[PDB]
Amino acid sequence: DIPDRKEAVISLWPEFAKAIVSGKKTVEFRRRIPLPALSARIWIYATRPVKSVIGFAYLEAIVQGDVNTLWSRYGREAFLSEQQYRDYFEGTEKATAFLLRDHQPIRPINLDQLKEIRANFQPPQSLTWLRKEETQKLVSLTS
Ligand SMILES: [Cl-]
Ligand SMILES: [Cl-]
């Protein structure tokens, strides 16, 4: 029984995780990774020291294309220096741009609660898809 990928979790360092949930960062760049559904809700897991899901946002678009064109068009909305961007994309010619909308902060759901939802949860290297019963438990914890 395969997840539909309309619900996914992504990991960011806490300054960037907070920028997405506050609506300051509306673009997240990644390499060519397996993609979520276009209508997905993306729950934002902040890594140490926060180690918590701190909110979510939705996708208005997924863009893939040349690394230079993605920087020129969307880099201003991504909250990262051009240097951090060039360093992350060294070694590939193409990138993914996740364009986000409708960000929502929540009271943080810590890693102990997350392991109560999925026993071996650990922060994803890219995306992880939530199963429907996992999603029902996470929505139940939201404030
Ligand atoms: Cl990667
Ligand atoms: Cl670890």
Author numbering: 3 to 145
Provide the authors' original text about this structure.
In the ethanologenic bacterium Zymomonas mobilis ZM4, the gene ZMO0922 encodes a 148 amino acid polypeptide, which has been annotated as a putative ASCH domain-containing protein (ZmASCH) that belongs to family 23. Here, we report the three-dimensional crystal structure of ZmASCH which confirms the fold of a central β-barrel core and reveals a positively-charged cleft with a pocket on the surface.
A deep pocket exhibiting a positively-charged protein surface is formed between helices α1, α3 and the central β-barrel. The methylated base is trapped in the hydrophobic pocket on the surface cleft, where aromatic residues of proteins interact with a methyl moiety on the base at one side or both sides. A long cleft (indicated by the yellow line in Fig. 1c) is formed at one side of the ZmASCH molecule. Similar to the observation with YTH proteins, the electrostatic surface potential map of ZmASCH shows that this cleft has an almost continuous positive surface potential. Importantly, this cleft encompasses the pocket.
